[PDB]
Protein backbone atom coordinates (compact mmCIF):
# COMPACT_ATOMS: atom_id res chain seq x y z
CA UNK A 1 0.00 0.00 0.00
CA UNK A 2 1.06 3.62 0.54
CA UNK A 3 3.40 2.65 3.45
CA UNK A 4 5.40 0.02 1.49
CA UNK A 5 5.81 2.40 -1.45
CA UNK A 6 7.05 5.12 0.88
CA UNK A 7 9.66 2.73 2.31
CA UNK A 8 10.83 1.93 -1.22
CA UNK A 9 11.11 5.67 -1.84
CA UNK A 10 13.08 6.25 1.33
CA UNK A 11 15.45 3.37 0.63
CA UNK A 12 15.97 4.81 -2.86
CA UNK A 13 16.63 8.31 -1.42
CA UNK A 14 19.37 6.80 0.79
CA UNK A 15 20.96 4.95 -2.17
CA UNK A 16 21.00 7.98 -4.51
CA UNK A 17 22.73 10.20 -1.90
CA UNK A 18 25.91 11.21 -3.70
CA UNK A 19 29.31 10.14 -2.33
CA UNK A 20 31.55 13.06 -1.36
CA UNK A 21 34.71 13.19 -3.54
CA UNK A 22 37.27 15.50 -1.99
CA UNK A 23 40.84 16.20 -3.03
CA UNK A 24 44.01 15.53 -1.00
CA UNK A 25 44.63 17.66 2.10
CA UNK A 26 41.11 18.96 2.64
CA UNK A 27 38.31 18.66 5.20
CA UNK A 28 34.99 17.06 4.23
CA UNK A 29 32.25 19.72 3.86
CA UNK A 30 29.41 20.31 6.37
CA UNK A 31 26.67 17.68 5.86
CA UNK A 32 29.09 15.16 4.39
CA UNK A 33 28.10 12.10 6.48
CA UNK A 34 28.71 12.88 10.17
CA UNK A 35 30.11 16.40 9.63
CA UNK A 36 27.70 18.86 11.38
CA UNK A 37 25.97 21.70 9.56
CA UNK A 38 27.68 25.11 9.48
CA UNK A 39 26.95 27.31 12.56
CA UNK A 40 24.10 29.47 11.30
CA UNK A 41 22.84 27.03 8.63
CA UNK A 42 19.30 27.03 7.15
CA UNK A 43 18.08 24.05 5.10
CA UNK A 44 16.52 24.64 1.65
CA UNK A 45 12.88 23.91 0.82
CA UNK A 46 12.77 20.25 -0.30
CA UNK A 47 15.73 19.26 1.90
CA UNK A 48 15.11 16.29 4.20
CA UNK A 49 15.55 16.79 7.93
CA UNK A 50 15.01 15.15 11.25
CA UNK A 51 12.34 17.25 12.95
CA UNK A 52 11.35 17.09 16.61
CA UNK A 53 7.61 17.18 16.78
CA UNK A 54 5.89 17.84 20.12
CA UNK A 55 2.53 16.02 20.26
CA UNK A 56 -0.48 17.74 21.83
CA UNK A 57 0.05 15.77 25.05
CA UNK A 58 3.72 16.82 25.08
CA UNK A 59 5.26 13.55 23.79
CA UNK A 60 8.41 14.37 21.77
CA UNK A 61 9.33 12.42 18.62
CA UNK A 62 12.06 13.01 16.02
CA UNK A 63 10.56 12.38 12.58
CA UNK A 64 11.67 12.45 8.96
CA UNK A 65 10.33 15.61 7.27
CA UNK A 66 10.88 17.86 4.25
CA UNK A 67 11.57 21.57 4.68
CA UNK A 68 8.85 23.83 3.32
CA UNK A 69 10.01 27.28 4.46
CA UNK A 70 12.00 29.27 7.04
CA UNK A 71 11.63 32.73 8.70
CA UNK A 72 14.50 34.62 10.43
CA UNK A 73 11.94 36.89 12.12
CA UNK A 74 10.91 33.94 14.32
CA UNK A 75 13.86 31.63 13.69
CA UNK A 76 11.31 28.96 12.67
CA UNK A 77 10.83 26.42 9.94
CA UNK A 78 7.80 24.93 8.29
CA UNK A 79 8.32 21.23 7.59
CA UNK A 80 6.17 18.46 6.15
CA UNK A 81 5.89 15.03 7.72
CA UNK A 82 7.29 12.80 4.98
CA UNK A 83 4.44 10.34 5.04
CA UNK A 84 2.16 13.23 3.82
CA UNK A 85 -0.78 11.51 5.56
CA UNK A 86 -3.59 13.82 6.73
CA UNK A 87 -2.20 17.09 8.17
CA UNK A 88 1.52 16.89 7.43
CA UNK A 89 2.78 20.46 8.15
CA UNK A 90 4.57 21.60 11.32
CA UNK A 91 5.99 24.96 12.41
CA UNK A 92 9.00 24.53 14.72
CA UNK A 93 12.11 26.21 16.05
CA UNK A 94 15.40 25.73 14.19
CA UNK A 95 16.81 23.83 17.20
CA UNK A 96 14.12 21.20 16.51
CA UNK A 97 15.53 20.49 13.04
CA UNK A 98 18.65 18.50 12.08
CA UNK A 99 19.46 18.60 8.37
CA UNK A 100 20.21 15.13 6.94
CA UNK A 101 23.58 14.61 5.30
CA UNK A 102 23.80 15.78 1.68
CA UNK A 103 26.64 13.34 0.86
CA UNK A 104 27.61 9.87 1.95
CA UNK A 105 31.04 9.84 3.46
CA UNK A 106 33.32 7.41 1.62
CA UNK A 107 34.92 5.19 4.31
CA UNK A 108 38.03 4.78 2.06
CA UNK A 109 38.73 8.49 1.67
CA UNK A 110 36.97 10.24 4.56
CA UNK A 111 36.61 8.15 7.76
CA UNK A 112 36.70 11.36 9.79
CA UNK A 113 33.18 12.02 8.34
CA UNK A 114 31.70 8.80 9.82
CA UNK A 115 30.20 8.22 13.26
CA UNK A 116 32.40 5.82 15.15
CA UNK A 117 31.79 2.65 17.15
CA UNK A 118 29.93 3.36 20.45
CA UNK A 119 28.94 6.91 19.46
CA UNK A 120 25.43 7.94 20.51
CA UNK A 121 23.29 8.93 17.46
CA UNK A 122 19.69 9.44 16.33
CA UNK A 123 18.87 6.83 13.68
CA UNK A 124 15.83 6.10 11.54
CA UNK A 125 14.27 2.88 12.73
CA UNK A 126 13.95 0.45 9.78
CA UNK A 127 10.53 0.43 8.13
CA UNK A 128 9.58 3.64 10.03
CA UNK A 129 9.94 7.39 9.44
CA UNK A 130 10.93 8.01 13.10
CA UNK A 131 14.42 8.61 14.57
CA UNK A 132 15.41 7.13 17.94
CA UNK A 133 18.47 6.95 20.17
CA UNK A 134 21.05 4.34 19.24
CA UNK A 135 24.76 3.50 19.57
CA UNK A 136 26.93 2.80 16.58
CA UNK A 137 27.88 -0.90 16.40
CA UNK A 138 29.81 -0.46 13.12
CA UNK A 139 30.50 2.34 10.64
CA UNK A 140 30.30 1.38 6.94
CA UNK A 141 33.56 -0.15 5.61
CA UNK A 142 32.61 0.26 1.98
CA UNK A 143 31.02 3.22 0.10
CA UNK A 144 27.54 1.58 -0.21
CA UNK A 145 27.30 0.09 3.27
CA UNK A 146 24.87 1.04 6.04
CA UNK A 147 25.77 1.83 9.59
CA UNK A 148 25.08 -1.04 11.97
CA UNK A 149 23.45 0.36 15.09
CA UNK A 150 22.06 -0.81 18.44
CA UNK A 151 18.80 0.93 19.19
CA UNK A 152 17.84 1.57 22.79
CA UNK A 153 15.00 -0.90 23.27
CA UNK A 154 13.54 -1.76 26.65
CA UNK A 155 11.83 -4.88 25.21
CA UNK A 156 15.31 -6.51 25.59
CA UNK A 157 16.57 -7.29 29.10
CA UNK A 158 19.89 -5.50 28.41
CA UNK A 159 18.12 -2.50 26.83
CA UNK A 160 19.46 -2.79 23.25
CA UNK A 161 18.31 -4.18 19.93
CA UNK A 162 20.49 -6.58 17.92
CA UNK A 163 22.56 -4.75 15.31
CA UNK A 164 20.24 -3.14 12.71
CA UNK A 165 21.25 -1.57 9.39
CA UNK A 166 20.56 2.17 8.82
CA UNK A 167 21.85 4.13 5.81
CA UNK A 168 24.15 7.13 6.08
CA UNK A 169 21.32 9.47 5.03
CA UNK A 170 19.33 8.46 8.13
CA UNK A 171 21.93 8.62 10.90
CA UNK A 172 22.40 12.04 12.57
CA UNK A 173 23.82 13.65 15.73
CA UNK A 174 21.96 12.67 18.93
CA UNK A 175 20.00 15.77 19.92
CA UNK A 176 17.61 13.75 22.10
CA UNK A 177 17.97 13.40 25.94
CA UNK A 178 17.33 9.95 27.59
Amino acid sequence: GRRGVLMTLLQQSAMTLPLWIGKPGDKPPPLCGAIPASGDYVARPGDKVAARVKAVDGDEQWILAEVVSYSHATNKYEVDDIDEEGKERHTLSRRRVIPLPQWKANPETDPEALFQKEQLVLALYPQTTCFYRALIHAPPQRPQDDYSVLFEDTSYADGYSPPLNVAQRYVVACKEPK
Binding site: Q61, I63, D81, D83, Y125, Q127, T128, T129, C130, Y132
Partner: peptide, 4 residues
Amino acid sequence: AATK
Protein backbone atom coordinates in the same frame (compact mmCIF):
# COMPACT_ATOMS: atom_id res chain seq x y z
CA ALA B 1 4.90 9.65 10.82
CA ALA B 2 5.20 5.86 10.70
CA THR B 3 6.17 4.92 14.24
CA LYS B 4 7.84 1.84 15.72
